[PDB]
Amino acid sequence: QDLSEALKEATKEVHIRAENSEFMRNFQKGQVSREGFKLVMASLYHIYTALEEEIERNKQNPVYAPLYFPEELHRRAALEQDMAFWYGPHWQEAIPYTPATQHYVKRLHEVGGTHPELLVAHAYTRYLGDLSGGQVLKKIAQKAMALPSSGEGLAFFTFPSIDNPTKFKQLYRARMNTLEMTPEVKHRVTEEAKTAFLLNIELFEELQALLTE
Ligand code: HEM
């Protein structure tokens, strides 16, 4: 069974759970506040920062390299733009770094530094979601918060170097499927993708609590 399939199958249950966190339920109904949107976007800033640091560290390592698509996919620069938009020119000292965000970053570093053959799980879990359901989430955010079609404040959701997310996502899958795979690696990769999903659920749980306090 192809890795791209193994991953989709292994994470379909947890994805349903992630969509139904209180925060994402509220987000999907169009109930997202500037305050809640800023918190999640600032948390993604840190998460993608760490993910992309580890991607760069491992760019030439054959357990990751077929997935090295910085120009098309990387989000740090977009998130920086969004932080300037939502937090102002001194955003770097204004943005929060929550404990659940710290926890996700810590695991990212563990993987990139000690278990790089698992880094595909983490890239799959964030980027493939961004290219599919993230585009739906984009449209809800825009409508909720009166964000302009010109894209300010939603740079994260915009892929100016990908013409067509569906076709790119098929390419990314195809390339995933060229990674050297043994039963060992495959089984652990799909386990780590479940953990990546859980780290996201735990973030959403935390942000909801911070918003309700
Ligand atoms: C309300 C929240 C969410 C909505 C409405 C949503 C919606 C979607 C939709 C419509 C797809 C396409 C499904 C398909 O093509 O069969 C998708 C795929 C994906 N989503 Fe999300 N999603 C949400 C949250 C998340 C979260 C929190 C994560 C991970 C952090 C995530 C990760 C992914 C991944 C990795 C895929 C690709 C599945 C694959 O094709 O292998 N999603 N989601």
From Swiss-Prot:
Subunit organization: Homodimer and higher order homooligomer. Oligomerization is crucial for its stability and function in the endoplasmic reticulum. Interacts with FLVCR2; this interaction is potentiated in the presence of heme.
Catalytic activity: heme b + 3 reduced [NADPH--hemoprotein reductase] + 3 O2 = biliverdin IXalpha + CO + Fe(2+) + 3 oxidized [NADPH--hemoprotein reductase] + 3 H2O + H(+)
Statement: the UniProt record of this protein carries the keyword Metal-binding: yes
Site (Important for catalytic activity): D130
Domain notes: The transmembrane domain is necessary for its oligomerization.
Cytoplasmic side: 1-213
The EC number(s) this enzyme carries: 1.14.14.18
Reported regulation of activity: Inhibited by metalloporphyrins such as Sn- and Zn-protoporphyrins.
Residues of the full protein shown: 11 to 223 of 289
Family (UniProt): Belongs to the heme oxygenase family.
Record carries keyword Lyase: no
Entry protein name: Heme oxygenase 1
Keywords attached to this entry: Apoptosis, Endoplasmic reticulum, Heme, Iron, Membrane, Metal-binding, Oxidoreductase, Phosphoprotein, Transmembrane, Transmembrane helix
PTM comment: A soluble form arises by proteolytic removal of the membrane anchor.
Subcellular localization(s) per the UniProt record: Endoplasmic reticulum membrane
Membrane topology field: Single-pass type IV membrane protein
Superkingdom: Eukaryota
Binding-site residues for heme b, renumbered to this chain: K8, H15, Y124, R173
GO cellular component: caveola; cytosol; endoplasmic reticulum; endoplasmic reticulum membrane; nucleus; perinuclear region of cytoplasm
Primary location: endoplasmic reticulum
Single GO MF annotation: phospholipase D activity
Induction: Induced by its substrate heme and CoCl2.
GO biological process, any: negative regulation of mast cell degranulation
